[PDB]
């Protein structure tokens, strides 16, 4: 019918001060660092041992939680510059047969570099991964009520594989995971047994985290069709700051900007955007200095920034899902 246009009308249920306070208190930057983040800080390119442990680590972290997370491994083969390779996207869905989903995403693969140092891509994107896992965890009790009326809308998480290029970045050597899965979702009926509608119609908003972890990030508002949602993040950021629930935060060094961006950033959203999915692309401009550098590592992460961004994202998600 018209359920696919529902996202066009969808409003947040906005949290009051005491609610914002509780959310800020319900996240632990320390507990994420250790249990969510630290394990991912390993070489995890496709086919690598790290690939396998990354996967393992993600499925296990989601499994220990009460909320009815359903997990799928979208695994497939594709030619690469190094010859055939196996890729596996991790999908973690609450209420899989809900017509609508807000979708958080990032890439868990790390880019291949030769070596006495090793590339672990802390900001790119182990920290986006831990943030999604910390969100899953921080909001468990509230997300668990989605099991129990209201819009036909729930939460999906996606950890893409094969995001990074093997050699020099190109349409055919990158976005292996996203390109596969977006194509799959495009041809998969949703809800089950529908005419016309695909799983991509069911994607209300793809929120893609990427390159998060550096001090003073600045995110531009990239896309008009998501700009209203970007304004939410700026309003959340602002309110959390005024309430004294951010750390080492000044309005002057705020993260979410009024302005947009000139060029066109290739990333996992691309195969979704070109088929018409609303994208809220939480990548900074500029990229962290450490971009594609052996310094893209832990020492160079900024705990407080990540904590602050955790709080903002969690609040956004609650308000989007009306929880
Ligand atoms: Co990268």
The two tokens of residue 53 are: 């442990």
Output the CA–CA distances (angstroms, integers) from residue 95 to 36, 147, 179, in the order listed: 24, 7, 24
In the reported structure, the alpha carbon of residue 111 is separated from the centroid of ligand 1 by a whole-number distance in angstroms of 6
Residue 87 burial by CB count (10 A; 0-12/13-18/19+): exposed, middle or buried?
buried
What the block records as the tokens of 249 is: 């935060």
Residues paired with residue 85 on neighbouring β-strands, in sequence order = 78
DSSP state, residue 287: P
Residues in the chain: 323
Q: Rg for the chain (alpha carbons), in Å?
A: 19
The string of DSSP codes covering 161-172 is: SS-S-SSS--SS
Q: Could you confirm whether 163 is annotated as catalytic?
A: yes
Q: Is 244 left (phi over 0), alpha (psi -120 to 50) or beta?
A: left
Determined by X-ray
The domain segmentation of the chain, as residue ranges, is: 3-321
Catalytic site residue from 43, 210, 296, 319:
210
> Phi and psi dihedrals of 102, rounded to 5?
-75, 135
321 CA distance to ligand 1 middle (Å)? 30
Residue for token digits 């994107």?
A: 125
Q: How far is the CA of 45 from the centre of ligand 1 (A)?
A: 11
Annotated catalytic residue 31: no
Packing angle, helices 303-321 and 17-25, rounded to 10: 130
What is the CATH topology of the domain spanning 3-321? Aminopeptidase (3.40.630)
Binding residues for Zn(2+): 124, 164, 292
Interatomic CA distance for residues 10 and 226, integer angstroms: 12
Structural resolution in Å: 2.3
């Amino acid at each position: 019918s018209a359920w696919p246009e529902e996202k066009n009308y969808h409003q947040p249920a906005i949290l009051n001060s005491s609610a914002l306070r509780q959310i800020a208190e319900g996240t632990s930057i320390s507990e994420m660092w250790q249990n969510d983040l630290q394990p991912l800080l390993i070489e995890r390119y496709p086919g690598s041992p790290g690939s396998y442990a990354a996967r393992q680590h993600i499925m296990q972290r989601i499994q220990r939680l009460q909320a009815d997370w359903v997990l799928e491994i979208d695994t497939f083969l594709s030619q690469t510059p190094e010859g055939e390779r196996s890729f596996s996207n991790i999908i973690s869905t609450l209420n899989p047969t809900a017509k609508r989903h807000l979708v958080l995403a990032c890439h868990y693969d790390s880019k291949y570099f030769s070596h006495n140092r090793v590339f672990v891509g802390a900001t790119d994107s182990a920290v986006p991964c831990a943030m999604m896992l910390e969100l899953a965890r921080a909001l468990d009790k509230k997300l668990l009520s989605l099991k129990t009326s209201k819009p036909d809308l729930s939460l999906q998480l996606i950890f893409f594989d094969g995001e990074e290029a093997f050699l020099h970045w190109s349409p055919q050597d990158s976005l292996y995971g996203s390109r596969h899965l977006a194509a799959k979702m495009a041809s998969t009926p949703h809800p089950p047994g529908a005419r016309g509608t695909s799983q991509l119609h069911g994607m209300d908003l793809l929120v893609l985290l990427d390159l998060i972890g550096a001090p003073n990030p600045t995110f531009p508002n990239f896309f008009p069709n998501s700009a209203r949602w970007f304004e939410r993040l700026q309003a959340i950021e602002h309110e959390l700051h005024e309430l004294g629930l951010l750390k080492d935060h000044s309005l002057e060094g705020r993260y979410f900007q009024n302005y947009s961006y000139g060029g066109v950033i290739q990333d996992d959203h691309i195969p979704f955007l070109r088929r018409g999915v609303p994208v809220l692309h939480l990548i900074p401009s500029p990229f962290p200095e450490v971009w594609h550098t052996m310094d893209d590592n832990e020492e160079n992460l900024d705990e407080s920034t990540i904590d602050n961004l955790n709080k903002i994202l969690q609040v956004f998600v609650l308000e989007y899902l009306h929880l």
